[PDB]
Structure formats: structure tokens, C-alpha cells
Amino acid sequence: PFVTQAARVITKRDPAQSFATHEYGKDVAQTVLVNGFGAFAVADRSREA
Amino acid sequence: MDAHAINERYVGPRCHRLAHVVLPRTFLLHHAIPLEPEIIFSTYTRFSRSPGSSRRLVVCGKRVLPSPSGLALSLPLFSHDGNFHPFDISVLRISCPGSNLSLTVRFLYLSLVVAMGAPPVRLSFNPVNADVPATWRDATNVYSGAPYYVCVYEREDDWLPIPLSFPEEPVPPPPSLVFMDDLFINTKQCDFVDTLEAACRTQGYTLRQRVPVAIPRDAEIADAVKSHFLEACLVLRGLASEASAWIRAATSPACWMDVLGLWESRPHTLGLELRGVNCGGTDGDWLEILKQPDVQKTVSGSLVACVIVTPALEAWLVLPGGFAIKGRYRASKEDLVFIRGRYG
């Protein structure tokens, strides 16, 4: 794949929770890092690599 | 889907053709339309190459609960002398009766006209019905880039397409005739800033106090207030909006105020009315300005400049620190007929 892209997912809330002050407060979001991965701390001996 | 068939009996005859339009949520999230049943819609169209105004009409709109889903409306189309114009904006104005909410939604006819293209005596009884089927045809708004649906209901009709009368030479380019409003207001704003920069040259590139507000003693603060004037000149030039303060002052029959969001930390609120304050320029009248809750935070706080416009089209740029510069919007008599027709 190409360079890892960030696609943000904005969905409507569940109809139990559809009450808010402003209009964007009915929608709650999430970021999905596409084609990347999660990782621990890299060793300091190969930080240059 | 009831609001289409209601409008054909009450808005329907008062027009020439209707533009049945259903707005999806992707359009509603962009223009931020909070769907309550209290909403009163109002529609009017802005003509081109003619004296531009049509009358205002109230159109009923209902939420459609689920094949699309969203707000359902009906837009009026006006045919002066037997034909449509292609570059002719239909403006939808959305407002609540009680609260502070005014939204302008703008449509173009070529996105709509193309989208329509494929013994006791008897008393009649004709109720409103959703019996007529719908044909869903796609579209995109030119101004925002959010898709909206158009219904085509079944009824010298099939023989002819919908009449259009394209403009004639010499003609400005249609990227400049579509945005007739945003190139008119932008040149008025760019000529407003040039009065402010000319007012510094006559004073010797200075900023004089007008509002008595004490300043804490630091040299970096005196450099910071100068940075609020240059940032406000990047904003007033870049701003070209339909509902600015001086436009409400030109179509007023009272000082008209709009604060600004400097360095993009705030969204702009435009057209705030100063009720009961007469901007005469005397030192008695600035105290009535200081009783406003906005002007206290534009001066004591930071990152917000403020523009106060008189009904004589003379305007001051209030900076934090109490500094102010008198400027003037220049509107000719030919320009006021252009503004009071389309906007007011």
C-alpha cells in the first residue's frame, strides 16, 4: 500500500442518546488509521534505523 | 414526503414551477440545520441581468423518517417572460421564530432545471395525497459540494424540454457571474480596509486611544496590540459574507456590530444589532457602547477585534486596548439599488 492514511468516521449516536445542546452533539467520531499499525517503544540502539 | 404535495396547493399556484428537493443529512451536517418542528422556511430568488428581487414565500418542510432520508422541501422557480435564466440563484433562508438562528442556503437553477429533465349538484373532493410516485434524481450543490435529491412527480409537455435562455455576448465569465455576491462584497471590504490604512497615514502611522482602559506595563503587550490591527486587516479583506454588518445598515428601514475571530480561534458572528445605542462619536455615546457585554471582552480580553457600523455607513475598528480608527464604507447610489434589491 501507499502512505498510511487517516480516515475519520463520524456516525450518529444510538437513539437512546440523541439529545444534545448543539447540532454536532448528536454525532460522535472516531479515527481509523488505515494501513498503519500500533507499536511499542523501539530500542534505542536502532533508533537511527 | 407530505410536504411536497402540500406545497403544490398553497405555494404551487403562486409560482411558475416548483423544485421538489429532499436534503440528506450530509447536506444538513455541512450547513448545520438543527431539525426541530418549529422551523419556518422562507424562499426568494436573486435574478441576474435584470432588476434582481422576487417576493418572499413560506415553504413547509418535514423530516422524512425511513430510498433517501432527511429534510424535504420544495423550492420555487420563477419564469419572467416565459423562460428561465440559467445563472439565477434561488436562496433558501432558514430561521427559528424565537431563538437567534438565521441560515442562508443557496441553490442554482442549472443544478435544478437539468435535474428535472428525464337534483343536488356535485362538489369536487380533492385532498392532499402522496399517491403520486417519486423518481429520485441525483444532484450536487455548486456552492458547498454536498449532494441533494430531486423528486420528479408524474402528472405540449413531452414534446418540449424545459425552456432556458442562455446569456448573450458580451458576458462576464460564469465563474464570476455565479458568485456575483461574493465578488461584490469582497471589493467593498477591500475598499473598507483601504480607508483604515489611509487613516493611519494622515495620523502618522499611529493608533490613538478612544476608550479609557488601563494597560498593564509591559513592552511585549504594546507590541501585541499592533499585531491585532495587522491580523484584522487579513480578516476584513478575506471576509466576503452575505450577512455582514454594513449590509444590514444599508437595508435598515441604530448601530450594527459584528465581532471578528482573529487568528481563526473563533467563528465569526455577524449582524449583531446595538439596540438603544446611538453612535454619534461624542464621549457620552461610547459609554453606552461599553455597557454591551461584547465590547467589554473585545477590549479587556484578546484575540477579538470588533467592527461597529453606523447607519451613515461610517465604521470604527475597535481593537483590544481601546484603540479605534474611523473608516468608511463607500456605497454609491447605483450600488444601494443593487444591495436593497437582492438582500433586503
From Swiss-Prot, chain A:
> Where is this chain's protein located in or outside the cell?
Virion; Host nucleus
In which domain of life is the source organism classified? Viruses
Describe the protein's quaternary organization and the partners it interacts with. Homomultimer. Makes the hexons and eleven out of twelve pentons. Interacts with triplex proteins 1/TRX1 and 2/TRX2; adjacent capsomers are linked together in groups of three by triplexes, heterotrimeric complexes composed of one molecule of TRX1 and two molecules of TRX2. Interacts with scaffold protein; this interaction allows efficient MCP transport to the host nucleus. Interacts with capsid vertex component 2/CVC2. Interacts with the small capsomere-interacting protein/SCP.
Q: What does this protein do?
A: Self-assembles to form an icosahedral capsid with a T=16 symmetry, about 200 nm in diameter, and consisting of 150 hexons and 12 pentons (total of 162 capsomers). Hexons form the edges and faces of the capsid and are each composed of six MCP molecules. In contrast, one penton is found at each of the 12 vertices. Eleven of the pentons are MCP pentamers, while the last vertex is occupied by the portal complex.
Family, per the entry? Answer: Belongs to the herpesviridae major capsid protein family.
Record's protein name = Major capsid protein
Q: State which stretch of the full-length protein is shown.
A: 886 to 934 of 1376
